[PDB]
Curated annotation (Swiss-Prot), chain A:
Gene Ontology, cellular component aspect: cytoplasm
InterPro entries in the cross-refs: Cold_shock_CspA, Cold_shock_domain, CSD, CSD_CS, CSP_DNA-bd, NA-bd_OB-fold
Subcellular localization: Cytoplasm
Organism: Bacillus caldolyticus
Entry function: Affects cell viability at low temperatures.
Oligomeric and partner information: Homodimer.
Keywords: Activator, Cytoplasm, DNA-binding, Stress response, Transcription, Transcription regulation
Protein name (database record): Cold shock protein CspB
Amino acid sequence: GHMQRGKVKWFNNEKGYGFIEVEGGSDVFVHFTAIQGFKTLEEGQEVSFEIVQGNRGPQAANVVKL
Amino acid sequence: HMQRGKVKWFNNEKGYGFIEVEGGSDVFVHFTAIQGFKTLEEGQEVSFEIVQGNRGPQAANVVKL
């Protein structure tokens, strides 16, 4: 098994989604349901996560804060 | 008003991709937004509106120019 690593580009805590920045690669969509932690995502937090293919494209899963 | 841009890429198996806007952020587009008989292809110039969907801004009313 492996994981992706990056940092929260932005996360809107009213809307419930944002994107993760991956150095050299595409941003990855992240929904609030993908957050494994106690607290919500905030700009700049480094995260480990995996990418799953949703109906409308890739998105983050199992997002943990490093 | 309508935005204008050009197809950056469109995954023709899954039905999604992005429209690039000059000096602007990319806009996500889904095959259901296409106002025409044919799919989107790289480099096609398009007009479109932006509406709010499940992933934020997405293209709507996409017409090939």
